[PDB]
Design a binder for this molecule. Structure first.
Ligand SMILES: Cc1[nH]ncc1-c1ccccc1Cl
Ligand SMILES: Cc1[nH]ncc1-c1ccccc1Cl
Ligand SMILES: Cc1[nH]ncc1-c1ccccc1Cl
Length: 468
């Protein structure tokens, strides 16, 4: 008999799994929300610095109304190469957000030393992709990489139809602090990463007024062979594609239909993405430069390094946030947590073809969230930034590992407003002026220099309907 070969791999469950890390796809966990798990690993935070400041360039008339299409194409061309490097080096891409991605190598404590060496090699090869690269003339296509290592907690929260996850703890905070110290072309190790690494492998230098270090070179011993070393490291990589599947970037490409697994995984993915996955919407429909209102919510914690306290508090806040968003068709696009602050990137006005009073409603939703979350046990401070304008929306990353993302100066502005103006609901000039709400509903604020923002315009606190 004939033997026609090659397994069919294009099932809905496989398409859904592209939107998720192995941490979730192969997770198998409890029905309870919140769910918490604890492990050790190495984290890599890759920032494509300056990229957002080039989303605004693609709004110009020169792109002839194909700005969003050209933006997603060039971003994915470069980000796909970074993703492929991470995946071939055995990493799990956790999330894409803003200009960045975060990857994880989960391993037992005893293997952390050797895995750091793998992750440094990976980081150097990523830099290597961009060594002789630009577009017009002064294009700064270079990345900044922070690495951290140590204890990691995962939190999964949500309701009967939606799930979200976050990674938490000192290694998570450290990786963002490390990437923030990086200049273009740097690999920065967190203090704990430098403490746990194989110091015979690397030459470092001190970072002024910091315990983190910069990697100058990976200079391995005379008898060292990276390929044979990496092979030894794969013993500890549960899902590294191997044997008959050694030609694949992810084991998740091999997932077979399983309705119970698909029910769990689809909860993490927006309904408009599922519509595209199901071939009920055109594959290009979600790449757009679209006017939206960003409502960026930050929850700061009492018992701040305490994962077992923060989990219930985030779940309780989430249950309220999702009810408020439902009424006015808002969406949670991203959640992430650093420096004991859990942030929700909420968006009013993307795939859906309508919403009339987007601004008064966005402000009222922000105040509702603010009032409720302020009364949640263990939540110390709630801060909300509200900004409105044109943002890029689209699926970013590699065919095998990508996520819907929102990118733009107004997203960065709302993020910076919630950090620089803590404990209040703030809005930009577009939102203030457009709402047509009486001026006494607001307080005009002092202008702050915000790292990353070049002229915010006037900013306002949304004071609310009453003096009290
Ligand atoms: C840089 C950027 N571009 N678009 C969004 C962002 C962002 C900035 C700070 C925190 C989180 C995010 Cl997502
Ligand atoms: C470095 C970066 N680039 N784009 C977004 C970010 C970021 C910064 C602080 C916290 C969270 C995020 Cl995602
Ligand atoms: C999921 C998460 N929890 N804490 C931080 C993050 C994160 C932040 C920025 C980019 C990617 C990720 Cl995974």
């Amino acid at each position: 008999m004939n033997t026609p070969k090659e397994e069919f791999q294009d099932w809905p469950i496989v398409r859904i799994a592209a939107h998720l890390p192995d941490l979730i796809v192969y997770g198998h966990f409890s029905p309870e929300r919140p769910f918490m798990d604890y492990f050790d690993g190495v984290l890599m935070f890759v920032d494509i610095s300056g990229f957002t400041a080039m989303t605004e360039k693609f709004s110009s008339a020169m792109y002839m109304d194909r700005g969003a299409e050209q933006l997603v194409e060039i971003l994915n061309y470069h980000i796909s190469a970074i993703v492929e490097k991470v995946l071939i080096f055995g990493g799990d891409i956790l999330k894409f957000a803003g200009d960045a991605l975060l990857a994880l190598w989960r391993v037992e404590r005893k293997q952390l030393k050797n895995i750091i060496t793998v992750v440094i090699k990976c980081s150097l090869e990523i830099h290597g992709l961009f060594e002789t690269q630009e577009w017009e003339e002064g294009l700064d296509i270079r990345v900044k990489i922070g690495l951290a290592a140590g204890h990691i907690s995962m939190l999964v929260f949500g309701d009967e139809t939606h799930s979200h996850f976050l990674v938490i703890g000192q290694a998570v905070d450290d990786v963002r602090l490390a990437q923030n110290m990086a200049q273009m072309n740097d690999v920065i190790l967190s203090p704990n990463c430098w403490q746990l690494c194989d110091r015979s492998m690397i030459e470092i230098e001190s970072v002024p007024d910091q315990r983190a270090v910069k990697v100058n070179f990976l200079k391995p011993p005379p008898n060292f062979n990276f390929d044979e070393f990496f092979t030894k490291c794969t013993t500890f990589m549960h899902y590294y594609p191997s044997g008959e599947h050694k030609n694949l970037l992810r084991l998740a490409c091999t997932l077979k239909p399983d309705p119970e697994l698909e029910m769990s995984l689809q909860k993490y993915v927006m309904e408009s993405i599922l519509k595209q996955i199901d071939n009920k919407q055109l594959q290009g429909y979600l790449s757009e430069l679209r006017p939206v209102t960003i409502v960026f919510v930050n929850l700061m914690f009492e018992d701040q390094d305490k994962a077992e306290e923060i989990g219930p508090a985030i779940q309780d806040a989430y249950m309220h946030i999702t009810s408020v968003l439902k009424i006015f068709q808002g969406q949670i696009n991203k959640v992430f947590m650093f420096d004991k602050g859990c942030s929700f990137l909420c968006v009013f006005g993307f795939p859906g073809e309508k919403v009339p009073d987007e601004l008064t409603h966005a402000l009222e939703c922000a105040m509702d969230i603010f009032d409720f979350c302020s009364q949640v046990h263990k939540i110390q401070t709630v801060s909300i930034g509200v900004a409105s304008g044109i943002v890029f929306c689209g699926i970013v990353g590699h065919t095998v590992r990508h996520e819907y993302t929102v990118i733009g100066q107004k997203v960065n502005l709302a993020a910076r407003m919630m950090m620089y103006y803590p404990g209040i609901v703030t809005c930009d000039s577009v939102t203030y002026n457009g709402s047509n709400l009486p001026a006494y509903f607001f307080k005009e604020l002092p202008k702050k220099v915000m790292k990353g923002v070049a002229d915010s315009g006037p900013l306002y606190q949304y004071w609310g309907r009453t003096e009290k």
